[PDB]
Design a protein around this ligand. Sequence first.
Ligand SMILES: C[C@@H]1C=Cc2c(sc3nc(SCCCN4CCCCC4)nc(N)c23)C1
Ligand SMILES: C[C@@H]1C=Cc2c(sc3nc(SCCCN4CCCCC4)nc(N)c23)C1
Ligand SMILES: C[C@@H]1C=Cc2c(sc3nc(SCCCN4CCCCC4)nc(N)c23)C1
Ligand SMILES: C[C@@H]1C=Cc2c(sc3nc(SCCCN4CCCCC4)nc(N)c23)C1
Lengths: 396, 396, 396, 396
Amino acid sequence: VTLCSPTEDDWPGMFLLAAASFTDFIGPESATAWRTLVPTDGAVVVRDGSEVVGMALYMDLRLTVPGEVVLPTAGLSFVAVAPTHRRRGLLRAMCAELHRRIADSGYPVAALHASEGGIYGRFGYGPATTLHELTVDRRFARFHADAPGGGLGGSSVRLVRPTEHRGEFEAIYERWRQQVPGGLLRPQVLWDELLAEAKAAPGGDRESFALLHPDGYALYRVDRTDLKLARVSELRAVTADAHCALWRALIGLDSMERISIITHPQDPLPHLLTDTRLARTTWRQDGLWLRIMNVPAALEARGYAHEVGEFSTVLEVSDGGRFALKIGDGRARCTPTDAAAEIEMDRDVLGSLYLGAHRASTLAAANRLRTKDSQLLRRLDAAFASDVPVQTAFEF
Amino acid sequence: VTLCSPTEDDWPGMFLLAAASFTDFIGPESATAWRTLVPTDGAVVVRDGSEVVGMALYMDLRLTVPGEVVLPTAGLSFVAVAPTHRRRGLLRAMCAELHRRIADSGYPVAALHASEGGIYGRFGYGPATTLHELTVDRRFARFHADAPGGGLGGSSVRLVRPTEHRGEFEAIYERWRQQVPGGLLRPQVLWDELLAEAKAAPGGDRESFALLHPDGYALYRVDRTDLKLARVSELRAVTADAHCALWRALIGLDSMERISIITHPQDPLPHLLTDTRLARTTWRQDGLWLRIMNVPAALEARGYAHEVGEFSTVLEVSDGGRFALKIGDGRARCTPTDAAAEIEMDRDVLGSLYLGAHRASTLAAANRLRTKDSQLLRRLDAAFASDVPVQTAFEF
Amino acid sequence: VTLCSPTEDDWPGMFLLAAASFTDFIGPESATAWRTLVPTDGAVVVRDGSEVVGMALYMDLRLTVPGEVVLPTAGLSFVAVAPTHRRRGLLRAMCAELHRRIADSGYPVAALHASEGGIYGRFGYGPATTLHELTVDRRFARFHADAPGGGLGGSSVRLVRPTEHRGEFEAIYERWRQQVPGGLLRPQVLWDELLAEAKAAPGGDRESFALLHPDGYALYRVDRTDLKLARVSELRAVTADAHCALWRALIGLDSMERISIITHPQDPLPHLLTDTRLARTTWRQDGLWLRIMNVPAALEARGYAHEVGEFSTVLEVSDGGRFALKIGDGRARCTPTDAAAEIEMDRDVLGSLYLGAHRASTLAAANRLRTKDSQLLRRLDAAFASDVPVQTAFEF
Amino acid sequence: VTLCSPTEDDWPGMFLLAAASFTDFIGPESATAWRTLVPTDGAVVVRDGSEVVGMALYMDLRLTVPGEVVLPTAGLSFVAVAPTHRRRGLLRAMCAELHRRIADSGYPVAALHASEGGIYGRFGYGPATTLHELTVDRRFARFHADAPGGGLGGSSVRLVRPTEHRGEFEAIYERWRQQVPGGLLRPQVLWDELLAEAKAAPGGDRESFALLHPDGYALYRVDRTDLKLARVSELRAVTADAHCALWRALIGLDSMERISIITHPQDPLPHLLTDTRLARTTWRQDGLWLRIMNVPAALEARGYAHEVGEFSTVLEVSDGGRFALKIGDGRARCTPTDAAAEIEMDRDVLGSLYLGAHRASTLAAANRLRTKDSQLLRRLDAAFASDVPVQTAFEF
Ligand SMILES: C[C@@H]1C=Cc2c(sc3nc(SCCCN4CCCCC4)nc(N)c23)C1
Ligand SMILES: C[C@@H]1C=Cc2c(sc3nc(SCCCN4CCCCC4)nc(N)c23)C1
Ligand SMILES: C[C@@H]1C=Cc2c(sc3nc(SCCCN4CCCCC4)nc(N)c23)C1
Ligand SMILES: C[C@@H]1C=Cc2c(sc3nc(SCCCN4CCCCC4)nc(N)c23)C1
């Protein structure tokens, strides 16, 4: 059991293990498109003294954090141990090697989407975004008098084939991702893959349509088996006008009973309707997980709430360093210190605070985050909050 | 169709309409217990020129708001129009009379639980608390090393018959309600009713048991039909130690597959487990609705986040007044002004901000709340936040 | 295996066999109420050379047929063979004895409700009424502008406890039953039983309520398990105004999603709504079965459509006689003849024609009814039609 | 928002709107086959000042009405408003233009199949045929001794590939459609489309088979997911012998549990079985909707029951004219008059009477049809009845 970077000859073995580990696997032709996002030493395989029994890699990503600040981000992905090689510390060995490489390459954070919710905490990954599914029973939905864009004259929203308005979608998404914490740069090859899955497959998914606003779009398709359900795969709006306009159009799908979307806890949609209850939360789950690789770099890089006044504390991350943390005018200075710690937490907890989706108060109540001063707890809660709500870009 | 206060002779007609309007109706014997909470002119009936075709009333309640401040609260309840008398403006007439009386009596707020989510917005009621159902698959649940009270020696939690530890339950709840926004004083007659429903009914609910900590308790029962599901009817914990200890005991119900609880969005339970995903959100809904009766009284009465610095604005409530609002050192002065408004909202929106469960940002995005300054929006978000998360006491 | 009339000592054995044969069995106390409707030689038992292994009986009923004509009707009921004594010709022996007795007593027809739909055809019983279940999704239901009783002023319909308006229910039902083919006289002891089942049972059915119009009523209850479904057990309306008024009240049960009713194919309810499709047919089944005991007596007793002009034919019933049938001015003369038959059918088929629920055309297409003249077929179709649609009174 | 006849350049925009409005849409290649049935000014589009946001059209159809009389019929179809352009009166504008054109072209009736049951009443369309789904549990089904074609010697019914017996299917259907009210001429291009859908699709429907009698056929296929269910897509029989023979063959599909068919209320199948209950009604819905364009032309064109004697009345259609209606010897003369009206109804109601599927009595009970003489009501019921039961040809 040797741990190496793959050679050209290893990739057939890697695509076999992928096909057997992931039910959603998109085949080797399209794996080669995502493979353009893997840098030269971004991948490790385990061979059995010989076929591939383990693999892991990272993609080069750009993640927007609070303050509209963009971080080079190592996107962990394609992680699989053969079912013949479980309980052998293969994941621990592969994750340790990729973390060494990601850290030495100068990435301040790593990120992933978890197959199960109990694997990645022990490697310093913390859930950092929250997925909300809203199912609207659109037959009862009426917009509130206060809702934008419900007047006379022509609608600003168009029904279009996605594949004929690539540039407009790209330009809107680019604006959205630079502006929203959790935003990822979507490279050309992922726009290739998104629009390939927009077309109907024989005995697969149905044709995807788009609703296009100057400042927003929604891609949607009728569900395979439930023909009265429309699944919004993606809705990016840069302005409230665009969000409302697009949802007026979705509520206008008169042959559907229900519209479903994976969105975020702070989606305003419920407040657009006379009956907020018509936007039911059907499903909730962790989205993006963050491992903070360099604590001072990550803490210094993001913006903090201007509302909370200047304050200083000593943060200890477990086997991750101790820092004099000073926050004021929405910036942080984070410096080495050996002063007594006032707040302690494992690396994963910091991940979960970092994009503003979890409150330090909530993690303190669970004793994931220890302090004896509850004034500092209120101050952390306020400081680490994002004025713009954290959202989830795309799964990788 | 006359609108009067009921006389002794009207109450049979009112209990008939109740039996036909509410499936959960607990019968006349026990309606007489809740009736002790209705003050002398707290009820209106509509007679048909004659039987009761409409009724509404309010109970005298005490509601904890941010800053551990307790408000006299008119609890709207027992609202019903006969199915023979729909679309007759009977609800509008009854709600208008009770609002006159509640306002003239000197109640700063009114509150209710909604049968549907689209009735009460137009009367100035806004959803002010959020119910989260968590279903734990307790077979996979392991507590995190960081979780409190997982050491050697005896457990501090006891399994008990609820009916033999009334005083301890009362004393813990009393501590909980004074300390948590959304807290209600539970009077003796509701403790009578809670413990009556704790016993097994023939072809009804199963025996309720209690888990009792010095600083917390949980009442739970196995579900009627799903014999592998335990339903936590109520869990009140004053300290994190008590919350964790009680959940260790619930995860210890080894004959159950699943533990379900109606709790709040900031419940730390997920963070107590190695796999946060094991506490799935099965259900979300509006809890307590608030109508702010007197805007200056309510705004002045509650505490504000000490983190945000002093600031002034002009708030207009639609057909509800305009005020110079000044917030600093966690207090507010709210005075009459005719200065140009900087922030406008309907009365219901203020209800939804008032306990901290909804962010002004989120309601602005839906245009339920209008301003042109986004600095003020951030400042409102921060000011109206509760350091202690808002919870839901009991349905009425 | 002897076939006798029961003695007082046989009735315990009969109530045991009833308890084991019928899941709906209402116990011996209430069996004694129905037993008042059994005449002195109306019952047969089979003993095993000794316990009761077979029973059958008939109740004295009054059945309204087309022309508002009321027939003494032998209501077959309480038919059961022990599971230990199947495939022994016990049903054939019991049915043959009761038919002898019913015929010699001077009953023109016998009637029953069938447990299965393939037992009773071979004994000359034909399905004579049709049960339609309509489920209304009442959340979408709006009454058509043309619908009666949708103006200003007070509703003529009252919500009441059934048990306090017995006389009004009795008087309306009495008007309904005299006026509608399929109508049965409901004796005092069945009004006793109907109102006993109107009250809530522990771990049984919920409280029944009534909607009372001067010319109509509806008894309804929320379903045991589906708390958003209201089950109309019975709706008797003498005038269209009453039918519409009562359905406006049912659509007004705002806490229900769905209203369900067992009614008849010609129920006007769909035509009262802007969307006829909202009254979905969830279920259809045979109601009352008729065996014509005396062909000339039954054919002469009922009224015929005045529209079709005078005509004569020769009807043969298989092992039931041949008759010169002459119909004109809505009356029939039916006399013995040996003239060549023009129309042949088994006794059961005549049962199915007799109340107007099945068309001779439809039974001819299946060759249940043979003729060579299709002019006569059109003439039978028209003659045997009821101007008032055939309905189902109550199960026995 | 301009309302024009489409040009060649509009049809891509129309096929896009079709793909997004109809889940069953059969793609542009096959839309071009149906397009042969659209006459030169049979289509209208709405452009947004520019893409297609609305469309409607009519196909040239031939509809058999009572008396085996065939009417030129404008078949409304391909009606869609963009979800971006709802609540804009676009359907009202398009329906008004097509009605002008259909009326000026000299069509006596228009017809459609409704997506929802509450859209088309207000445009004068009334439900005119009824769809019954029968599901037979064929494991219990035995044919009655009276059923045709159950003797010795060879079966007259053959199992065949549909695609090899096109001419026989065409010739039987042509006989069926000329003979049955609701019958439509099926043109060559719809026979092309029917047989294309007869073949197995990858991850779609299974191979269709045919049962072929000299005077009848059935096309059937096993259901995609329920492999014990056979779905009869279509069964056309000209003689009772053919109907019975074909159903003996269907009951002979020994590897199926259940046979399902969309048929009509008067299908004799139940009466072919010893247990009529084995043919359960699983589903009921409106089929063909009729708008009577010219009242005197339509009323004069169809045959009336010869049974009812000559009579005269004055019919008023709401904003549709008043007529002296005289019916005798199965013909009607319908002439302009200003004499006082004896019977009033909206245009849609006449639609529903016209093919005999709804009784004037039933529509009177709902007050959709007003008269003060109930003798005339009985006379209308009888006159407008079809001796041959009304059936549904094919959806368009
Ligand atoms: C070598 C190259 C590296 C990454 C990679 C491929 S295919 C490919 N497909 C996807 S799409 C599904 C994402 C959801 N995912 C599913 C399981 C749970 C986590 C979230 N993503 C990639 N990163 C790659 C090959
Ligand atoms: C006169 C007296 C006034 C209030 C009152 C009774 S019984 C009684 N039972 C209850 S328990 C169910 C609460 C849930 N509720 C159910 C429907 C939706 C709203 C929330 N509550 C009361 N306030 C009273 C009679
Ligand atoms: C001796 C006396 C004779 C008839 C009789 C009893 S209980 C009693 N309960 C009923 S209620 C259920 C009717 C539905 N029925 C259920 C099975 C299928 C047929 C339809 N009816 C009776 N005739 C009697 C005892
Ligand atoms: C231009 C041409 C006009 C009519 C037309 C096409 S495709 C095409 N497909 C069909 S098949 C489905 C009928 C069911 N229908 C489905 C929705 C509800 C109503 C009933 N029918 C057409 N008339 C056309 C294009």
